[PDB]
């Protein structure tokens, strides 16, 4: 569900 | 009049189309410059037209080509700049599409140049707006896989938040800026981890977890860093703590499985 590698 | 070979290698060339007014001067490092940019590929295909692109000179907010060529322009000048991909969107390209290794023709019109803000004298509202702008820059650099530039924008975003020792902000502003700092530090950790800067990524990860101990991204990134360093004994409870928050997450499973299998030497 949470995309690691994505930036906030 | 003639082409100026800025770096002495024919990779970044500038030709003045329209000169600036007789009294015009060049912008200096730190100034907030506003330009009108018309970007096109080597074959003539137009990418986008930003009529009022605003960026801080020497901060690498957009592309290296702009920070290297704009200090050679007078306020009010229109210049044509041919730049190699290495000073632009590099071996990967970008979101408003740029092909890998594509050389760009930038038609720049430097409009204004005002002195850079005194970070120490910024209001809470201005501090939020500047930090968010640098965060958005870092994010754009990260998507392209320019982790050196992404880390720099996140580093500048943090420096803007933390230089508040001489201004009185409200509690609501302090809290809002704390939420922004954690997002920037996690983003910095994501960037450092990609550059194998393990000791730095760990610091950023640990600072995020001091504010938000149940941050799944910071837990996974701390675990992945500790695993890549060979600290398997410290990595497994942290990677498990992150799986406890999202048990169905395939990426955390794949990371744990890889770590436990390698833990057989």
XYZ file of C-alpha atoms in Angstrom:
273
model
C 0.000 0.000 0.000
C 2.834 2.524 0.868
C 5.242 3.117 -2.033
C 8.797 3.159 -0.665
C 11.053 5.114 -3.087
C 8.266 7.787 -3.317
C 9.116 11.224 -1.944
C 6.680 13.446 0.104
C 26.654 38.866 -31.623
C 28.967 35.782 -31.363
C 28.690 32.427 -29.521
C 30.341 32.389 -26.084
C 31.760 28.976 -25.155
C 31.119 29.307 -21.378
C 32.882 26.151 -20.106
C 35.428 26.015 -22.980
C 33.991 22.670 -24.137
C 31.289 23.216 -26.784
C 28.672 21.833 -24.365
C 27.268 25.136 -22.976
C 27.173 28.004 -25.529
C 25.453 31.426 -25.176
C 24.451 33.928 -27.889
C 22.909 37.308 -26.961
C 19.761 37.917 -29.090
C 18.586 41.171 -27.445
C 21.038 43.019 -25.140
C 19.948 44.503 -21.803
C 19.346 48.283 -21.297
C 22.494 50.574 -21.331
C 22.689 50.681 -17.494
C 21.785 46.987 -16.817
C 24.006 44.792 -14.606
C 24.447 40.998 -14.179
C 22.720 39.058 -11.350
C 24.885 37.676 -8.496
C 24.778 34.323 -6.581
C 21.888 34.251 -4.100
C 19.602 36.688 -5.970
C 16.042 35.601 -6.771
C 15.847 35.856 -10.559
C 12.671 35.762 -12.735
C 13.066 34.535 -16.338
C 10.841 33.671 -19.378
C 12.055 30.286 -20.606
C 11.335 28.637 -23.999
C 12.847 25.124 -24.033
C 13.236 23.097 -27.252
C 15.064 19.903 -28.273
C 17.977 19.645 -30.781
C 15.453 18.715 -33.565
C 13.276 21.810 -32.809
C 10.464 20.154 -30.781
C 9.227 22.575 -28.054
C 8.991 21.157 -24.497
C 7.292 23.977 -22.426
C 7.056 27.770 -21.987
C 7.440 29.149 -18.461
C 6.675 32.908 -18.763
C 7.706 33.718 -15.150
C 10.127 30.984 -13.851
C 11.378 32.149 -10.413
C 14.560 30.602 -8.938
C 17.519 31.482 -6.681
C 20.824 31.798 -8.571
C 23.411 29.154 -7.582
C 20.836 26.956 -5.710
C 20.213 24.552 -8.724
C 16.414 24.820 -8.296
C 15.681 23.723 -11.912
C 18.712 22.724 -14.107
C 22.498 23.366 -13.923
C 22.372 25.024 -17.430
C 20.354 27.963 -15.993
C 22.632 28.509 -12.935
C 25.731 28.452 -15.227
C 24.428 30.709 -18.043
C 22.095 33.257 -16.294
C 25.015 34.920 -14.265
C 26.448 35.842 -17.742
C 23.235 37.769 -18.668
C 22.329 41.363 -17.837
C 18.886 42.088 -16.308
C 16.718 42.610 -19.449
C 18.749 40.467 -21.848
C 17.354 37.783 -24.207
C 19.816 35.007 -24.948
C 19.919 31.640 -26.720
C 21.701 28.914 -24.753
C 22.645 25.517 -26.208
C 23.270 23.020 -23.433
C 24.320 19.354 -23.358
C 22.076 16.876 -21.438
C 24.561 16.669 -18.510
C 23.683 20.308 -17.525
C 19.968 19.636 -18.181
C 17.795 16.483 -17.621
C 20.691 13.993 -18.123
C 20.772 10.289 -19.010
C 17.142 9.802 -17.781
C 14.903 12.683 -19.001
C 11.883 14.279 -17.214
C 8.022 14.423 -16.484
C 7.039 17.148 -19.113
C 8.982 14.722 -21.395
C 12.667 15.113 -22.276
C 14.372 12.112 -24.025
C 17.496 10.554 -22.370
C 20.743 12.375 -23.365
C 18.778 15.172 -25.123
C 20.608 18.467 -25.733
C 18.470 21.562 -25.121
C 18.088 25.010 -26.710
C 16.958 27.451 -24.052
C 15.595 30.869 -25.114
C 15.970 32.847 -21.881
C 14.818 36.365 -21.113
C 16.126 37.551 -17.740
C 13.327 39.862 -16.469
C 14.209 40.813 -12.850
C 16.899 40.128 -10.196
C 16.207 41.052 -6.555
C 18.439 40.440 -3.524
C 18.005 37.048 -1.850
C 15.886 36.883 1.329
C 17.508 37.039 4.772
C 16.470 33.568 6.039
C 16.862 34.893 9.626
C 14.309 37.695 8.909
C 11.607 35.578 7.151
C 8.048 35.434 8.511
C 6.441 32.048 9.394
C 4.223 32.320 6.245
C 7.259 33.144 4.002
C 9.322 30.375 5.692
C 6.557 27.840 4.827
C 6.398 29.098 1.159
C 10.206 29.043 0.657
C 10.678 25.564 2.280
C 7.799 24.145 0.228
C 9.283 25.600 -2.988
C 12.702 24.014 -2.273
C 10.905 20.705 -1.338
C 9.039 20.822 -4.698
C 12.397 21.440 -6.474
C 14.058 18.514 -4.644
C 11.054 16.297 -5.541
C 11.413 17.192 -9.277
C 15.199 16.313 -9.111
C 14.443 13.034 -7.297
C 11.833 11.833 -9.900
C 14.558 12.167 -12.657
C 17.079 10.262 -10.425
C 19.288 13.337 -9.786
C 19.885 12.500 -6.132
C 22.821 14.910 -5.715
C 20.542 17.881 -6.711
C 17.476 16.452 -4.836
C 19.580 16.201 -1.625
C 20.754 19.822 -2.116
C 17.216 21.219 -2.484
C 16.072 19.254 0.607
C 19.179 20.544 2.452
C 18.200 24.133 1.457
C 14.568 23.477 2.422
C 15.705 22.403 5.936
C 18.170 25.374 6.301
C 15.212 27.753 5.529
C 13.014 26.078 8.237
C 15.733 25.962 10.983
C 17.088 29.570 10.607
C 14.306 31.043 12.863
C 16.323 32.115 15.997
C 15.498 35.885 15.517
C 11.792 35.812 14.401
C 8.711 35.191 16.613
C 6.299 32.738 14.907
C 2.969 31.400 16.287
C 2.650 27.823 17.726
C 0.551 26.826 14.641
C 3.438 28.031 12.380
C 6.143 26.167 14.422
C 4.070 22.901 14.237
C 3.422 23.365 10.442
C 7.179 23.883 9.885
C 8.004 20.788 12.042
C 5.710 18.693 9.805
C 7.579 20.109 6.758
C 11.039 19.491 8.266
C 10.206 15.734 8.875
C 8.984 15.432 5.225
C 12.236 17.126 3.975
C 14.501 14.975 6.258
C 12.773 11.746 5.056
C 13.172 12.984 1.446
C 16.852 13.744 2.223
C 17.253 10.154 3.632
C 15.623 8.724 0.443
C 18.213 10.737 -1.584
C 21.284 9.888 0.599
C 20.368 6.110 0.529
C 20.372 6.243 -3.320
C 23.917 7.768 -3.179
C 25.079 5.055 -0.675
C 25.727 7.890 1.843
C 24.750 5.465 4.632
C 26.078 7.456 7.635
C 24.183 10.583 6.463
C 20.976 8.680 5.501
C 21.022 7.101 9.013
C 21.216 10.551 10.709
C 18.281 11.834 8.649
C 16.310 8.559 9.329
C 16.982 8.761 13.098
C 15.963 12.471 13.216
C 12.629 11.675 11.464
C 11.967 8.758 13.884
C 12.673 11.028 16.887
C 9.659 13.160 15.753
C 7.554 10.357 14.229
C 8.519 6.883 15.653
C 5.822 5.123 13.526
C 6.943 6.643 10.151
C 6.932 3.551 7.889
C 9.173 5.210 5.227
C 11.856 6.231 7.757
C 11.699 2.767 9.424
C 12.064 0.937 6.073
C 14.894 3.284 4.937
C 16.758 2.907 8.296
C 16.363 -0.901 8.053
C 17.498 -0.973 4.367
C 20.586 1.216 5.262
C 21.485 -0.959 8.299
C 21.005 -4.099 6.069
C 23.260 -2.688 3.255
C 25.912 -1.809 5.898
C 25.802 -5.416 7.191
C 24.136 -4.626 10.574
C 21.563 -7.456 10.154
C 21.039 -7.788 13.970
C 19.864 -4.132 14.172
C 17.997 -4.110 10.796
C 15.569 -7.080 11.349
C 13.563 -5.606 14.383
C 13.294 -2.198 12.563
C 12.184 -3.853 9.255
C 9.720 -5.971 11.325
C 8.399 -2.838 13.162
C 7.615 -1.351 9.647
C 5.919 -4.627 8.550
C 3.805 -4.497 11.751
C 2.256 -1.214 10.378
C 1.633 -2.693 6.854
C 1.733 -6.544 6.946
C 0.607 -7.002 3.286
C 3.406 -4.676 1.904
C 5.381 -6.720 -0.690
C 8.435 -4.348 -0.624
C 8.998 -4.788 3.188
C 8.602 -8.628 2.801
C 11.098 -8.726 -0.125
C 13.535 -6.626 1.934
C 13.219 -8.905 5.018
C 13.511 -12.121 2.965
C 16.652 -10.745 1.148
C 18.189 -9.779 4.533
C 17.466 -13.142 6.303
C 18.786 -15.191 3.262
C 22.037 -13.092 3.112
C 22.373 -13.574 6.965
C 23.900 -17.080 6.202
C 27.719 -16.543 5.911
